[PDB]
Design a protein around this ligand. Structure first.
Ligand SMILES: O=c1[nH]c(-c2cccc(O)c2)nc2ccccc12
Ligand SMILES: [Zn+2]
Lengths: 161, 47
């Protein structure tokens, strides 16, 4: 039940999503090992993901969380990079999309920095890079990221050493 | 998947060394995220 609608680059919605992507690039402590060496992206396409069943699943949970947290869902827009992007857009996020060995336990991870999520597009630590050239810093191959609506509710704050 | 800490719905990883890093977040229920936008892109080689 998922359809993808292309946004025009003239659409204000395309432009605000592109700005969030570009403006949250940073340098990484691995010198580019996982995600590649870059300061900006070439955005090729932005598509809206439309699935009524998955949206209703989200809003059902959002209301449950809101009611447990003084009517505050604490909703954010965050990036997610994954080799499972095709499964996610068709079937939703679930346990198969969790980072089992993550710093904060086995859950589904999201980032404010688009470049952080870019490190996971080809797998944990960038895996072996792009399927065609085996290059984690491939400048040719097309990559995909999700920009996701995420309900945080009451969030446990972990300081990172 | 793990459970959220008791009385919490997510975890926020706040950076405490790298002053330029933004936060990262973890949820433990797939129903707490919806994939709104699919962005297709290339990384650009620095000049
Ligand atoms: O975008 C992310 N994806 C993933 C990710 C996605 C799918 C599988 C997996 O093992 C990790 N982990 C992250 C960890 C920190 C910050 C961002 C991400
Ligand atoms: Zn490639």
């Amino acid at each position: 039940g998922t359809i993808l609608i292309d946004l025009s680059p003239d659409d204000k919605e395309f432009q605000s999503v592109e700005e969030e992507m570009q403006s949250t690039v940073r340098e990484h402590r691995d010198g580019g090992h996982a995600g590649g060496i870059f300061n900006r992206y070439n955005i090729l396409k932005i598509q809206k993901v439309c699935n009524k069943k998955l949206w209703e699943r989200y809003t059902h949970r959002r209301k449950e969380v809101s009611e447990e947290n003084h009517n505050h869902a604490n909703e954010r827009m965050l990036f997610h990079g994954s080799p499972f992007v095709n499964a996610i857009i068709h079937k939703g996020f679930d346990e198969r999309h969790a980072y089992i060995g993550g710093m904060f336990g086995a859950g589904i991870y999201f980032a404010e920095n688009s470049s952080k999520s870019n490190q996971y597009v080809y797998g944990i630590g960038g895996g072996t890079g792009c399927p065609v050239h085996k290059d984690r810093s491939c400048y040719i191959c097309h990559r995909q990221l999700l920009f996701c609506r995420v309900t945080l509710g009451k969030s446990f704050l972990q300081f990172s050493a | 998947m793990a459970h959220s800490p008791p009385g919490h719905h997510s975890v926020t990883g706040r950076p405490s060394v790298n002053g330029l890093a933004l936060a990262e977040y973890v949820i433990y229920r797939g129903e707490q995220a919806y994939p709104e936008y699919l962005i297709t892109y290339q990384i650009m080689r620095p000049e």
